[PDB]
Protein backbone atom coordinates (compact mmCIF):
# COMPACT_ATOMS: atom_id res chain seq x y z
CA UNK A 1 0.00 0.00 0.00
CA UNK A 2 1.33 3.54 -0.44
CA UNK A 3 3.56 4.98 2.25
CA UNK A 4 2.42 8.49 1.26
CA UNK A 5 0.62 11.45 2.76
CA UNK A 6 -3.03 10.92 1.76
CA UNK A 7 -4.86 14.22 2.03
CA UNK A 8 -8.20 15.81 1.04
CA UNK A 9 -10.05 13.77 -1.64
CA UNK A 10 -7.23 11.19 -1.88
CA UNK A 11 -7.84 10.46 1.82
CA UNK A 12 -11.51 9.53 1.34
CA UNK A 13 -10.78 7.55 -1.86
CA UNK A 14 -8.22 5.45 0.10
CA UNK A 15 -10.70 4.84 2.93
CA UNK A 16 -13.49 3.82 0.47
CA UNK A 17 -10.99 1.36 -1.10
CA UNK A 18 -9.73 0.22 2.37
CA UNK A 19 -13.19 -0.04 4.16
CA UNK A 20 -15.19 -1.65 1.37
CA UNK A 21 -18.51 -3.19 2.36
CA UNK A 22 -18.35 -1.84 5.90
CA UNK A 23 -17.97 1.79 4.91
CA UNK A 24 -16.21 4.47 6.94
CA UNK A 25 -16.56 7.68 8.91
CA UNK A 26 -14.92 11.02 8.08
CA UNK A 27 -14.72 13.54 10.95
CA UNK A 28 -14.63 17.32 11.36
CA UNK A 29 -11.19 18.95 11.36
CA UNK A 30 -9.72 19.60 14.79
CA UNK B 31 -8.29 12.81 13.71
CA UNK B 32 -7.63 11.19 10.38
CA UNK B 33 -6.08 14.34 8.92
CA UNK B 34 -3.40 14.68 11.61
CA UNK B 35 -2.39 11.00 11.22
CA UNK B 36 -2.68 10.26 7.53
CA UNK B 37 -2.59 13.74 5.96
CA UNK B 38 -0.29 15.63 8.27
CA UNK B 39 1.89 12.58 8.83
CA UNK B 40 1.53 9.27 6.99
CA UNK B 41 -0.43 6.12 7.79
CA UNK B 42 -0.18 2.36 7.67
CA UNK B 43 -3.23 0.75 5.99
CA UNK B 44 -3.78 -0.54 9.50
CA UNK B 45 -4.09 2.96 10.88
CA UNK B 46 -6.53 3.90 8.08
CA UNK B 47 -8.58 0.87 9.10
CA UNK B 48 -9.25 2.47 12.52
CA UNK B 49 -11.47 4.78 10.47
CA UNK B 50 -13.69 2.03 8.99
CA UNK B 51 -16.99 0.93 10.67
Ligand SMILES: [Zn+2]
Pocket residue numbers: 010
Ligand atom coordinates in the same frame (compact mmCIF):
# COMPACT_ATOMS: atom_id res chain seq x y z
ZN1 LIG C 1 -4.46 15.80 -5.64
